[PDB]
Amino acid sequence: NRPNRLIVDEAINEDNSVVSLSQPKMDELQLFRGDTVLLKGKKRREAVCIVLSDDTCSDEKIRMNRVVRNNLRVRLGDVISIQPCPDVKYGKRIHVLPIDDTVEGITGNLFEVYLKPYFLEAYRPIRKGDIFLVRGGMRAVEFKVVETDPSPYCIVAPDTVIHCEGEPIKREDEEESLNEVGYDDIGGCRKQLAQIKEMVELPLRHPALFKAIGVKPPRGILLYGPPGTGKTLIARAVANETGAFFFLINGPEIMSKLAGESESNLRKAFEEAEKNAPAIIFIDELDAIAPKREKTHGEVERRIVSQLLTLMDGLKQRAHVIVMAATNRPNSIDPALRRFGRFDREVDIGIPDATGRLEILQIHTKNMKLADDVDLEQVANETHGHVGADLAALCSEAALQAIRKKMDLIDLEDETIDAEVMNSLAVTMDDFRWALSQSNPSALRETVVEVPQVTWEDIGGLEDVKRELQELVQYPVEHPDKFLKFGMTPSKGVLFYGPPGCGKTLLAKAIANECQANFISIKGPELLTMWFGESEANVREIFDKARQAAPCVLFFDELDSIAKARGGNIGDGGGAADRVINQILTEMDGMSTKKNVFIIGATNRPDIIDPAILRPGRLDQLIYIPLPDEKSRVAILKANLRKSPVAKDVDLEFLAKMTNGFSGADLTEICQRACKLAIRESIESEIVPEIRRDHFEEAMRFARRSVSDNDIRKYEMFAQTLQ
Amino acid sequence: NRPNRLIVDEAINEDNSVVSLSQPKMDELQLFRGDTVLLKGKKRREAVCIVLSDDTCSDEKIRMNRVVRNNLRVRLGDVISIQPCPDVKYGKRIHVLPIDDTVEGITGNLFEVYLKPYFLEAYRPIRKGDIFLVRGGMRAVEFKVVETDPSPYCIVAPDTVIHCEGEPIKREDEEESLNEVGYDDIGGCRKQLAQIKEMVELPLRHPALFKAIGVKPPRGILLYGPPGTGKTLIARAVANETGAFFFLI
Numbered sequence: 005n006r007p008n009r010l011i012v013d014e015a016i017n018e019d020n021s022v023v024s025l026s027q028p029k030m031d032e033l034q035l036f037r038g039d040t041v042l043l044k045g046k047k048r049r050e051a052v053c054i055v056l057s058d059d060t061c062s063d064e065k066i067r068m069n070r071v072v073r074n075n076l077r078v079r080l081g082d083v084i085s086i087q088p089c090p091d092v093k094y095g096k097r098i099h100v101l102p103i104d105d106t107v108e109g110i111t112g113n114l115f116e117v118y119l120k121p122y123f124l125e126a127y128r129p130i131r132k133g134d135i136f137l138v139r140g141g142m143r144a145v146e147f148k149v150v151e152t153d154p155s156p157y158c159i160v161a162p163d164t165v166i167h168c169e170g171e172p173i174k175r176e177d178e179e180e181s182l183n184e185v186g187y188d189d190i191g192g193c194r195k196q197l198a199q200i201k202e203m204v205e206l207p208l209r210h211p212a213l214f215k216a217i218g219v220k221p222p223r224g225i226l227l228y229g230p231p232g233t234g235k236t237l238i239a240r241a242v243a244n245e246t247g248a249f250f251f252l253i254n255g256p257e258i259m260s261k262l263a264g265e266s267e268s269n270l271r272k273a274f275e276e277a278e279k280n281a282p283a284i285i286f287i288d289e290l291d292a293i294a295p296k297r298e299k300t301h302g303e304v305e306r307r308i309v310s311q312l313l314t315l316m317d318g319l320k321q322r323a324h325v326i327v328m329a330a331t332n333r334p335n336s337i338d339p340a341l342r343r344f345g346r347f348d349r350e351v352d353i354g355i356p357d358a359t360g361r362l363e364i365l366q367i368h369t370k371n372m373k374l375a376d377d378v379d380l381e382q383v384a385n386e387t388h389g390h391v392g393a394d395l396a397a398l399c400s401e402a403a404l405q406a407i408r409k410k411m412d413l414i415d416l417e418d419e420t421i422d423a424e425v426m427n428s429l430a431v432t433m434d435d436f437r438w439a440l441s442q443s444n445p446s447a448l449r450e451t452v453v454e455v456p457q458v459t460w461e462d463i464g465g466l467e468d469v470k471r472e473l474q475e476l477v478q479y480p481v482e483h484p485d486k487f488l489k490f491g492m493t494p495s496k497g498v499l500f501y502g503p504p505g506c507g508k509t510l511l512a513k514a515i516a517n518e519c520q521a522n523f524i525s526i527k528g529p530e531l532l533t534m535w536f537g538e539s540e541a542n543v544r545e546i547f548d549k550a551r552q553a554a555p556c557v558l559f560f561d562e563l564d565s566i567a568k569a570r571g572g573n574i575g576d577g578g579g580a581a582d583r584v585i586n587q588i589l590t591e592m593d594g595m596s597t598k599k600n601v602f603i604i605g606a607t608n609r610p611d612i613i614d615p616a617i618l619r620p621g622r623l624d625q626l627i628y629i630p631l632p633d634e635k636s637r638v639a640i641l642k643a644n645l646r647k648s649p650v651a652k653d654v655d656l657e658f659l660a661k662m663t664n665g666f667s668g669a670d671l672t673e674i675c676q677r678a679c680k681l682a683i684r685e686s687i688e689s690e691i692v693p694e695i696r697r698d699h700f701e702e703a704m705r706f707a708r709r710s711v712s713d714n715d716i717r718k719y720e721m722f723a724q725t726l727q
Numbered sequence: 728n729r730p731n732r733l734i735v736d737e738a739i740n741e742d743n744s745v746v747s748l749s750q751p752k753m754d755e756l757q758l759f760r761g762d763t764v765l766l767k768g769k770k771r772r773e774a775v776c777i778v779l780s781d782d783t784c785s786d787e788k789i790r791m792n793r794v795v796r797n798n799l800r801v802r803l804g805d806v807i808s809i810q811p812c813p814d815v816k817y818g819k820r821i822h823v824l825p826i827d828d829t830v831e832g833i834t835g836n837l838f839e840v841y842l843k844p845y846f847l848e849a850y851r852p853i854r855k856g857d858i859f860l861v862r863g864g865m866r867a868v869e870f871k872v873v874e875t876d877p878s879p880y881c882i883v884a885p886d887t888v889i890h891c892e893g894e895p896i897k898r899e900d901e902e903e904s905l906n907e908v909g910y911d912d913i914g915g916c917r918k919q920l921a922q923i924k925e926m927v928e929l930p931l932r933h934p935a936l937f938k939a940i941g942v943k944p945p946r947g948i949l950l951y952g953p954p955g956t957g958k959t960l961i962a963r964a965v966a967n968e969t970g971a972f973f974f975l976i
């Protein structure tokens with residue numbers, strides 16, 4: 005269909021002016037990784053960029069960063085024309101020059117720093133007019149090239165004399181400035197980022213179609229998550245990047261006004277925004293306006309929760325407006341806000357995980373120029389519990405520490421503090437570890453939901469259980485119509501039972517990982533909390549959170565916990581049923597047909613579990629998890645030692661021999677007991693620094709087995725008795 | 728880097744006009760515990776103080792109390808110039824004289840008490856203009872030395888005839904009065920005192936930098952503790968000592 009045009013799409017690399025083509029296009033465009041290519045754009049303008057070769061991209065989507073797009077005036081999903089330019093011709097000092105307000109308090113010589121490092125080792129091709137952006141010294145300043153000695157475009161060479169100027173030509177009115185947040189400023193919430201963009205792509209990008217079609221596009225979207233997880237960030241990025249007019253209501257501003265000065269700004273906020281359409285109204289802190297409940301007193305509060313309901317109703321789909329509202333927990337707001345036609349979509353931004361806390365950290369230091377040893381992987385490992393704002397606060401406190409150890413050491417403080425001096429400034433690992441030492445996990449801790457990092461590589465033995473579990477959890481999600489051929493419902497429960505420390509937890513996490521599914525762990529103390537606190541209404545919030553995190557594995561560990569707290573060898577006079585397990589029964593059997601929520605219980609006392617859990621439509625598959633065998637006891641010892649260094653001198657299958665049986669936990673005990681005797685040696689020294697066989701022999705002096713061969717027979721009994 | 732300048736920092740002793748140097752500096756400045764030293768300060772003014780020798784201080788930080796700093800116009804973290812003055816020359820009755828409102832209901836003869844005990848056993852060196860402060864009888868009254876018979880500075884000796892006056896010259900508008908609380912008025916909360924000063928040092932002391940840098944300085948701080956533990960005290964001291972405008976809701 006005249007394959008010249010191509011779509012624009014996001015790109016992974018940090019560098020500017022690099023487009024990443026789909027590899028089965030090589031000889032079509034005929035141009036390799038050494039050829040720069042001209043790209044057509046809106047208001048009659050272009051750019052030229054060197055090309056990279058990668059597998060994962062789609063065929064039709066060019067991958068390029070924000071700066072190369074803004075000048076093109078392409079917004080993601082737009083199409084550009086890609087035509088080669090082998091005809092490239094080098095320049096002699098293209099003239100480059102500072103812009104915006106960015107251009108903040110800088111002074112002196114910014115060219116040996118904000119240019120010369122960047123142009124070097126590069127040959128970065130530059131067409132006159134590009135905004136190409138540089139970063140250093142806790143700031144991103146971009147230099148627009150106003151003049152190119154040859155034209156239109158030029159490679160840069162190390163041999164072009166370089167022109168010191170530094171004058172502040174103000175940015176033109178019509179371009180929308182770069183400082184503003186795009187999608188690449190959002191680190192760690194991306195699964196849901198596709199979700200919001202999917203909802204809003206067609207309404208915001210294509211106003212014509214919904215006037216040319218019968219259908220209803222989403223009227224309002226409810227972003228919810230703990231505070232500081234980037235909900236405002238998301239709304240702004242989506243608005244800024246689609247180009248739609250972003251209006252911002254925040255609850256306390258509306259609540260700041262007097263009665264009738266309030267709802268006027270509110271009903272003006274939409275009657276102002278529906279002009280500028282397509283537009284996004286972001287109502288964050290929707291709890292401030294709209295907790296319509298028992299708890300509000302007064303008419304004027306109840307008035308404002310009203311009229312918000314009827315501005316939601318008032319948009320007739322001739323409004324191109326999308327309404328986003330940020331909330332913290334969903335029960336927070338008035339339930340009539342969720343009527344269909346007000347806030348129909350509900351999207352949970354959630355706490356970022358270790359794998360996500362990395363990207364956030366890497367977004368909030370892109371201007372710093374760090375120090376070489378800090379790896380941001382273990383920085384991202386000990387920041388657990390931090391939302392993305394906690395993370396932004398960490399690295400800014402890191403950078404204010406390092407500015408405390410240096411600089412004003414001399415007291416160089418002048419009118420405008422020097423450029424080259426902050427670029428020298430670097431922040432080492434001893435700053436960040438000092439940044440964490442502060443209170444910063446002052447944000448929320450509630451039930452986590454993320455893909456665990458335990459692959460099957462971590463579980464010694466249990467081969468048959470590993471394949472049994474895959475069938476239970478995998479085959480239904482992958483191959484449904486096969487289940488439909490025999491008219492079968494996949495069983496959605498499992499109950500692991502066996503002695504303690506045999507890996508019932510590991511297996512559950514391992515299988516969530518193999519599915520790349522979310523894993524919610526409800527541990528024993530949390531069920532006991534509901535049972536003492538007589539609050540089993542919490543079990544509903546647990547399953548609805550699995551439903552929103554689906555596909556997920558929901559794991560009840562120590563499901564016998566409440567049965568124990570009642571005794572159970574003699575125990576109370578009652579039956580097996582109790583408050584909390586009752587609500588687990590209720591919420592299980594009353595759950596949605598298949599949302600890919602798979603329920604795993606685990607127990608070390610299958611004896612005293614109530615049998616109602618067992619009935620079909622519940623945890624329906626009992627899987628015994630035995631004490632390991634020396635076959636497995638070898639892989640248990642290795643999967644523990646696959647991190648810490650273990651010299652060849654100490655040998656395994658002989659340790660794994662001497663134990664008639666231990667738990668996989670008793671073996672980790674031995675391992676960790678040995679590794680303690682080692683570090684004891686290494687800290688002391690020197691006044692050698694690795695593990696040794698005699699470390700493990702002193703460890704084995706304390707090796708105890710927690711399972712007494714009595715109850716294995718008891719466990720052996722529950723096995724054949726049940727079938 | 729032209730090691731003349733040095734930073735100002737807090738000091739443990741109760742007495743006035745004593746700066747406590749870092750001991751591995753002895754022969755650099757070449758001056759021992761028997762030499763008085765001239766220190767440069769803002770709006771073209773100085774002071775001279777005898778020196779003490781201690782281990783725990785940093786190398787770059789002079790340790791001196793509030794009174795010796797206020798006239799210097801140095802606020803902690805500022806830098807002053809330290810140059811020796813073995814050339815010291817004694818005075819004959821520097822003229823000293825009461826100031827502020829402090830100067831409250833006092834009367835009769837305050838010189839046998841608010842001066843003569845303090846000058847004694849001392850040789851306290853005094854440059855014309857110093858505010859050096861004395862305490863007695865449930866009040867702290869400070870006497871500014873308006874006139875020095877030789878100049879600029881003088882040791883005091885027990886042999887200088889002493890001038891009874893006691894007149895209330897009102898304090899000049901531009902100096903920020905001593906009665907106001909500093910860090911040394913806060914006794915027992917100090918671990919967190921370093922914490923608040925760490926948070927607020929760079930934003931309050933260096934307004935230029937956060938305009939010259941991308942970053943966000945702390946917007947608000949929440950002091951909490953049982954009532955009467957000095958939370959207002961802390962906020963005022965930090966404000967008064969960095970010099971920033973303190974508003975109180």
Ligand SMILES: Nc1ncnc2c1ncn2[C@@H]1O[C@H](COP(=O)(O)OP(=O)(O)O)[C@@H](O)[C@H]1O
Nearest residue numbers: 189190191192231232233234235236237392393
């Ligand atoms: N996922 C994220 N990626 C990058 N930055 C984030 C993320 N989440 C939060 N932040 C940072 O946290 C700060 C607070 O974000 P904001 O959206 O105001 O919080 P909330 O989510 O409560 O609305 C923002 O300045 C943003 O830079």
Ligand SMILES: Nc1ncnc2c1ncn2[C@@H]1O[C@H](COP(=O)(O)OP(=O)(O)O)[C@@H](O)[C@H]1O
Nearest residue numbers: 462463464504505506507508509510640668669
């Ligand atoms: N079969 C095993 N293979 C590897 N490690 C194990 C095994 N069993 C136990 N462990 C180690 O012991 C710890 C406790 O095991 P856990 O998963 O709690 O089992 P359970 O739930 O049966 O008590 C885990 O951290 C795990 O690393």
Ligand SMILES: Nc1ncnc2c1ncn2[C@@H]1O[C@H](COP(=O)(O)OP(=O)(O)O)[C@@H](O)[C@H]1O
Nearest residue numbers: 912913914915916953954955956957958959960
């Ligand atoms: N750590 C302290 N050191 C010295 N004085 C203190 C201290 N804490 C309290 N005070 C005294 O207690 C009085 C009450 O202090 P104030 O700051 O008003 O109380 P709060 O801490 O409730 O704000 C102040 O006059 C102050 O002199």
